[PDB]
């Protein structure tokens, strides 16, 4: 399938070169997979989600996304126009308040929630969790991400936006999950992207158009935007049967575009997520 005039990041993940604008992908499109977006919520009524999104858990007075961040990330995973995996099922877990903040205890509870809740959902092709969040190093936060991964969920986490080594941030620094840095449309490391040996992969993260609250759209930047590209890619590849939740991060690294990014510090992987779809 071909989506013309796609957001640059979608075109990038199906291309061996920057500078194109059509997204190419297998029409299975993540059908039968599920992606949990652990964030500020999801505006599930947005026409872009087509009834495939729902809130399943909140730790606050509402499950609605009063911020926009979670809706944007969910849109990059799976919206019809802005999403990588256009037929996946999206489940929202609101661990962040409408200012975008959350206590680590709540975030940990949300990860353990997903590890159990997937047993209440129909995801025959597999389960992914997208975590566009983080703070300073916490062994308990890393352990929760490791449990979620161990339970059979492909966990993708943001590297962070500090232009620093991600070893000092959580859950970015957990070795067993997929830690995602950000790139721009010219294949440069995004100016804010964290780096370091704990990164597994880069995805598009500068000037990413996606869904927003109020039935709208906007373009924003962050490792928060790169992470759902990788989460959606995992769901797409799992639906194709090419990989599993336990092996998808490694498979994405195996099949990435290699050595094409600029300003990658010595010791950080130079790997850009790529779907290897041959039309």
Curated annotation (Swiss-Prot):
Residue stretches in coiled coil: none
Domain Peptidase S8: 7-279
Reaction(s) catalysed by this chain's protein: Hydrolysis of keratin, and of other proteins with subtilisin-like specificity. Hydrolyzes peptide amides
Cofactor(s) demanded: Ca(2+)
Family note: Belongs to the peptidase S8 family.
Disulfide topology: 34-123, 178-249
Enzyme active site: 39, 69, 224
Record keywords: Calcium, Disulfide bond, Hydrolase, Metal-binding, Protease, Serine protease, Signal, Zymogen
Positions of Ca(2+) 2 binding: 16, 260
Cofactor descriptive note: Binds 2 calcium ions per subunit.
Keyword Protease: yes
GO molecular function terms noted in the UniProt entry: metal ion binding; serine-type endopeptidase activity
Name assigned to this protein: Proteinase K
Cited function: Hydrolyzes keratin at aromatic and hydrophobic residues.
Originating organism: Parengyodontium album (Tritirachium album)
